[PDB]
RNA sequence: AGUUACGGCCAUAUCUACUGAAAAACACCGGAUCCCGUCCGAUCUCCGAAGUUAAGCCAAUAAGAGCCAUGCGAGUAUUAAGGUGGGCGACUACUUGAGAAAGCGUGGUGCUGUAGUUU
RNA sequence: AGGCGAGCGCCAUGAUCAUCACGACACACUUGUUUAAGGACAAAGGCCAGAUGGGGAGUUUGGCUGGGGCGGUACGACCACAGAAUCAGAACGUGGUCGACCGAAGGUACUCACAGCGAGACGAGAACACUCGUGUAGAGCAUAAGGACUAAAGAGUGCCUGAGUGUGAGCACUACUGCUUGCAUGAGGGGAAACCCGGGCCUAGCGAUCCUACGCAUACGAGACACUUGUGGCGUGGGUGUCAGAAAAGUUACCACAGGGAUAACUGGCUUGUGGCCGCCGAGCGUAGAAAGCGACGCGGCUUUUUGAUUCUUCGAUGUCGGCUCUUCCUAGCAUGGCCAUGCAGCCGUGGCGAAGUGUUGGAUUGU
RNA sequence: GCUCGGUCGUGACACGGAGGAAAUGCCAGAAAGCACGGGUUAACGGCGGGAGUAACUAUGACUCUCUUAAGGUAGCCAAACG
RNA sequence: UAGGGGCGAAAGACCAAUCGAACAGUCUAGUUGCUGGUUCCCUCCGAAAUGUCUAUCAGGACAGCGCGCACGCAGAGAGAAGCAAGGUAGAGCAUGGGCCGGUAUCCUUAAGGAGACGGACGAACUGCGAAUGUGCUUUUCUUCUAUGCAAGCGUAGUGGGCGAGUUCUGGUAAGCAGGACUGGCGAAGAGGAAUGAACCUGGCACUGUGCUAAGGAACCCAAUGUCUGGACAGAGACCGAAAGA
RNA sequence: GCAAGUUGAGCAGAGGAAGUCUGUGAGGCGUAGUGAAGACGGAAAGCAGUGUGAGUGCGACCCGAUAGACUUGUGAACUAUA
RNA sequence: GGUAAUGCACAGUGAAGAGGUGGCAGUGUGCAUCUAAGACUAAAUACAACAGGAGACCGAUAGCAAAGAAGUAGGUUGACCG
């Protein structure tokens, strides 16, 4: 699947159509200071073994394509969801018809 | 085993009749509908928006609400041994005006005359009910021109 | 009464040969300078009247093909209810009811709405 | 505080604190070398942290199934067939498909067809490019199957990113999911305009609570006030295919317990494919000649003595193969008695009929 | 599997470093192991297929071909092992 | 030398008639979706063995079918009369699949091929199309109806079914395995088929007199005789095929 | 029984007394809802008892495992070995 | 219950004379409230043996195991059992 690097679309904050910059969303790093991390650290602490379950019988191959789009004027962001695909490319050459 | 998609088992239903393929006729689009009319559903397979589920094909119901190019029709259905009302959205290409009230409306037109006179002259209407066909009538016959019947045909 | 513009129901209107047609139209027809579009003024777009009923459109003809109706096929095929009916079965007779199709014969061959024009 | 290369890093040595070997003493510590020998090492204790660890400890080792196991997946989805013409409707019933793919194969406006067949046109042939006439789809429509489509939904050509943003109501047995439809908005798109568009012509391509990542504004914050961290709310992603969602390998012939004829290993019952026995027909063969004796290719039966198929009875128990011993019954007749046919000279036979009274043995190898 | 040698890399806590008002984080550091190179079967164990070819026929000493960590030697056999 | 321990010329042998983990006592009345049992009378009403989800298949929960209390009340497991939808039985072989033979004529060969046509066919072929069954409106439409219906609230049992008639799928079949429709036995006695869960007649408080059903009427055993044709086989009343004199 | 209200909380005063009568006097639920919250606000008789059907937890209708653990409890008079 | 530590310990480290706390981690600053690392204390509260009084309790297969010479007759190698 090929996606262009730019898209003119409606910006909710500006309340009219504007140019946006287009790219794949990126998963950030887990923080030790959140309530879930704190709870788990304390529970693991003693001689208690493994205290929470871990998935082993996994089954899926792909994961869903998700695009982050940024408004060039006001820097606000929107998230667009596009379904499952094994491979993704940004800004490659057009699928020109009637090749040799 | 069978499957359970939205258009399961519709090979015979949802197919055009012989020498009747193509889009609908102008009369379909120029018919005006109103709340409270009785209407009859027959799906046109060539139109892919506003199709009802195939249970409703060939059933008749009553118009509840009217929109730009679609209608909402009320139906009743038995589920788990109880009666349930159902509100079905249909596009105007898949409906035709029902004939089911025709005779009753004629009868009302006759009643509407009598019920006025019944205030002036009588006290109660005669009301013009239908009656089922009675016994066989009496006959007077001239008795010339007799025809005899016989087992002449041997039927080898 | 036809035609023509815009229609309704979508073959009684289709397909193949032939033949007719006052008037007014409808056409074929004559050019590309411009607007517009082509490998190509063939098609599409524009500007025209020297010609012509040869064509189309309209109408007639044909033991024509196809379509539409009706009669017959036929109370035939199949079928609902019933009995301590029959048959080793496969299946089938009877009593009170409902009731076809293909073939084949005979007839048809568009009907109409609103406006405009022509003895 | 010195020196090098167009104040930089690089090369010299001079002051300031830890610090690793090596020596030489004896004071901790060690040893019945004890009025002694070793010596800050050893050996022995303590607190944290990595590695190894069936030596042990706990526990687990899905379901459906013509009994279980091995095999398949009828375990989540989609089309067609059948189920005596609404809808629904079982079996490890039938023919198949799915866990994706695509900036166009998405949205709009306009133009024109196609597969073939009959004539033509140098090289040029069965099969090269160009034309004329016919052409209801005999073609195409990415990917199963069905349905749909003709001045198009197919093939080309132009422009666009609606594969917008808030918030309602409903349909499929309706939670998740998929689709249909209302109102409001965009310094939205395509088209002259009427019209159409919030993915793919329609029916399939998918996933809760808690935790965590990101986007969006509006909240909270402990006696008070400021900031760095944190906690709330809505929406999407990260995943459970056993697909309405536990974190999981074997073996027991040393074996235990609760139950089951809801379910196997005998017999019996129903069935008779397979096993065995009998009829019908007459192509050919028999030295001539269908039929003394045979009888291809086909067709109809009977039996329960073989082995299957099924699970009705028994799992708080019906003692399981063969032999020994002893009795009775059946006939589809091997001998013995009476007869008929003959390819019956006689002798020996072969095919059939009524008949179950009396007979049908001794041994070698082998559990048979 | 056991055993021997070196690090070239990884690999804990402590001990340091930079920054910030401070917490939390970040960076360095890092034995033995692991990786890497050798030894070892009276350690666990393991030890092949296909074609042609000799003056009757058969059989193949001989040849070619695929393959490996090595392709079952000396003996023994329808053996309590066919 | 003592129990997750001993001892063993090794058999999981032996450790007070106990050993593939001793005895005593306690926690403890451990747990059980599994087996057994569960104590007086009469009156009235009366089921289910099906759907969805479940580490679910000998169990649950939700819904469906009972009963009790009942605010209230024009309704109905039947017909007519207008109106819709359907692709089965029959019938056919016009698109698609597909068997055998063709006159004239045509094409070549001097073979064969095509053919104006006839016969034979499909669960996944259709050009036509029933009966029976399904839904809508009308009491302004016959006929019944209070000793009747009944929202709502609370709560039970059930979730192994089996059989007849008519039909269907798998299988050589089966008292075999699995669906659909209308009544049964389950939970149903009485009279009849000699006997039999389900077949025929026909639904049960307690007495008395009459009458009929189904099935019987020489005798067993309450009631029996008549007329007309067939039939001779230790036949038939109870009973098997193709083939035959 | 009382009703926009209601109640035997504990505890005090009286009384030849485990009864009864009287006080003082909390709390709880109700008198109207909406949101996570900041915040806002606009329908519906309740409270306490005496009993019956029914759910959940405790031995939980009655009887019934093979097993698991704990003791500063016992045993080599049978049998094993020094 | 105590949630970026409610209390108690062990090893390293280790104060100030001024310190501790104000149910969410950190740094600063006012405000409120207390004074740890030494000791003693009545009343109102809990419950066997033994004694006394009561009861909608049981009545010799019941009620404590035991209404008489009952933890007895009797039993285990023993602990213990009855
Ligand atoms: Zn913006």
TrEMBL record, chain A:
One of its GO terms (biological process) is translation. InterPro entries: Ribosomal_eL44, Ribosomal_LSU_eL42, Ribosomal_zn-bd. The keyword Protein transport does not apply. One of its GO terms (molecular function) is structural constituent of ribosome. One of its GO terms (cellular component) is ribosome. PROSITE patterns: RIBOSOMAL_L44E. Zn(2+) binds at residues 11, 14, 71, 74. Keywords: Metal-binding, Ribonucleoprotein, Ribosomal protein, Zinc. Residues 35-46 have a biased composition (Basic residues). The keyword Zinc applies. Residues 27-58 are annotated as: Disordered. Belongs to the eukaryotic ribosomal protein eL42 family. This is 60S ribosomal protein L44. The lineage of its organism: Eukaryota, Fungi, Fungi incertae sedis, Microsporidia, Spragueidae.
TrEMBL record, chain B:
GO terms for molecular function: structural constituent of ribosome. Pfam families: Ribosomal_L21e. InterPro entries: Ribosomal_eL21 (IPR001147), Ribosomal_eL21_CS (IPR018259), Ribosomal_eL21_sf (IPR036948), Translation_prot_SH3-like_sf (IPR008991). GO terms for cellular component: ribonucleoprotein complex; ribosome. Mg(2+) binds at residue 9. Belongs to the eukaryotic ribosomal protein eL21 family. This is 60s ribosomal protein L21.
